[PDB]
Amino acid sequence: GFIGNSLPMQAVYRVIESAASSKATVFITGESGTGKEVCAEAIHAASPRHDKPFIALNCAAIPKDLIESELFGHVKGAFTGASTERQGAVEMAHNGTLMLDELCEMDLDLQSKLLRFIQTGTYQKVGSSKMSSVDVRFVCATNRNPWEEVQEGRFREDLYYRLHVIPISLPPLRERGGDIIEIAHALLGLMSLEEGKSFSRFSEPVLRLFESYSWPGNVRELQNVIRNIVVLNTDDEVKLEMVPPPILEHHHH
């Protein structure tokens, strides 16, 4: 799902291709908005497991006390709101790839259970005593510094060294050269389709601004900017006056 042939991304692509044939755990880091799930899916797609499921568990989009239920499943009646027997992400990912996204959101109790599961493949549904097992290839990702999280006692040390086998550091958007405009063009067409518009090009000032702006929010911020432009304007061409703040203002500091 990655777009672009920039020098730093081509190093990423080589690691993805080599790692895909291995079952070794991948640990993706990088600034917010750099494409960790895109990277995780690309590893799966290049792997011999590509025809099996790819499952992403976003530990941030879930309350911390419910990550275990989302990960391992639960039986009906396990806790108060357990109206149904839920199948965990580990079961959805059996014979495939499981992405543990924003993994550092797990509490230390769940990190202990996860350490067990990563070693043995065994787990229990929440509220159940029965042991089960699955075969998943792990891909971990976080926007925190996984090492600082270990130092501040927030992440298990033995868990870190079990997961940090194949690290991948995604480059920030500002360092990806021609990728910025290529991604911007893809977003322009897609958001035009989503909004019923027909933008097809960027004016030269907009291209210069996009290529020199630091994009602290990376591709997420670029998505915001393109959506802002397409929603608020109707034209074939993106003009400089359409670019929202703080793009020009913070670019000059």
Ligand X SMILES: CC(C)(C)COC(=O)CNc1n[nH]c(=O)[nH]c1=S
- Binding-site positions for ATP: 3, 33-38, 220, 223
User: Which residue, 91 or 179, is less far from ligand X as judged by CB?
Assistant: 179
Tokens representing 137 are: 């290839």
Shortest distance (Å) from residue 63 CB to ligand X: 25
Span of 65-73, 119-127, 136-144, 180-188 interacting with ligand X by CB under 6 A? 180-188
Q: Residue 217 corresponds to which tokens in the numbers above?
A: 């929010």
Decide: is 183 part of the binding site for ligand X (CB under 6 A).
yes
Nearest approach in angstroms of CB 213 to ligand X is 16
Q: Side-chain half-sphere of 182: how many Cα atoms within 13 Å? A: 11
Annotate each residue in 3-22 with x if it binds ligand X (CB under 6 A) or - if it does not, as one string: xx------------------
* The one segment of 30-38, 60-68, 114-122, 243-251 that binds ligand X by CB under 6 A: 30-38
Q: Which stretch binds ligand X (CB under 6 A): 98-106, 118-126, 178-186, 232-240?
A: 178-186
Specify the pairing of strand 97-101 against strand 137-141.
parallel
- Distance of CA 204 to CAs 199, 207, 208, 223, 238, Å? 15, 5, 6, 19, 9
- With contacts defined by CB under 6 A, name the span among 2-10, 56-64, 148-156, 227-235 that binds ligand X: 2-10
Amino acid in position 192? S
Cβ–Cβ < 8 Å for 247, 228: no
Smallest gap from Cβ 108 to ligand X, in A, equals 30
The residue among 44, 36, 39 whose CA lies nearest residue 1 is 39
User: The tokens of 4 are what?
Assistant: 């672009």
User: Known binding site: residues?
Assistant: 3, 33-38, 220, 223
Residue 168 sits in the site that holds ligand X (CB under 6 A): no
Name the minimum Å distance from CB 169 to ligand X.
13
- Contact between 35 and ligand X (CB under 6 A)? yes
CA distances 85 to 67, 72, 81, 152, 215, Å, are 15, 11, 11, 36, 43
Q: Does 186 engage in binding with ligand X (CB under 6 A)?
A: yes
Query: Which residue lies nearer to ligand X by CB, 59 or 187?
Result: 187
Strand order in the sheet with 26-29: 54-58, 97-101, 137-141, 26-29, 166-169
Q: Which residue number is nearest to ligand X in terms of Cβ?
A: 35
Euclidean distance between CA atoms 109 and 154, whole angstroms: 11
Q: Report if residue 38 touches ligand X, rule: CB under 6 A.
A: yes
Interface with ligand X (CB under 6 A): 1-4, 34-35, 38, 179, 183, 186-187, 190, 219, 223
